[PDB]
Amino acid sequence: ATIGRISTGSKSLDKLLGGGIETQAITEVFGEFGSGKTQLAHTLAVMVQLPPEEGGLNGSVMWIDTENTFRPERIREIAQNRGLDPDEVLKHIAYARAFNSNHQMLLVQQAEDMIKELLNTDRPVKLLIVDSLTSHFRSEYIGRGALAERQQKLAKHLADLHRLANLYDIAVFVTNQVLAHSATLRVYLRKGKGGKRIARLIDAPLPEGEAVFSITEKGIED
C-alpha cells in the first residue's frame, strides 16, 4: 500500500512532516509535561476521520491510554469545530485504559482483532495511539541494560506496534515524556513564548527548521 498522511491541523507542522504523520510508520512525539503531546493525539484522532481532501483518511482510531489523559469532551470540541459530528467521531474511536506495562502490551494484540474486523470496511483503522508509550515501563522497571526487563519488554512492544503499522497500513502515534531510535520518526515538542508550541525533527537529516503552532478549539492550528 502507498503511504497515507494524516494532517495535524497545522500547515507548519504538516510541512515539517512532509504532509502529515504517515501510515506504515511509528511517529513518536517527546517533550516535557505541558508540551502538547496529548493535544496532538486528540487532534489526530479527529483529523484522521476527515476525507482525504481535508487531510484525513476516512479512518477509525484505536487509543491505548496509560495516564488517564483521554478526554471525550476534547474530542467533541475538536470534532464540531472541524465540521464533523462529535457523536460519529467518538463512535469511531475505540478506547482502552492500560493498567500496567504488561496489560499495555496485551492490548496491542487485542487491538489487532478489531483492526482485522475493520480492515475491509469503509472505515478501517488508520490511527493507533499509545499515550504514554513509556510511563508504565519507567515506573515499573528500574534497569537500563539491553538484557534488563524494561528494554526487553519495550523492544517487543515497539516491534508489535511496528508490525501493525506496516501489515495493516496504520499510522501509529506514540508519546514519550522527557530504544530511542525505534520510531520511524521522532518529533521533539516544547512549549515556547506566549503558549506557542515548537516542533523539531530529531535525527532526520526531512526538512531542517522548526514548526510552530497553537492549541485551540480546533485542536491545533497555525
Binding site: 484505536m62 483521554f70 471525550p72 467518538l90 469511531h92 474511536i93 475505540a94 478506547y95 492490548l107 487491538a111
Partner: peptide
C-alpha cells in the same frame, strides 16, 4: 476496547 470500547467506543469512546
Amino acid at each position: 476496547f470500547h467506543a469512546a
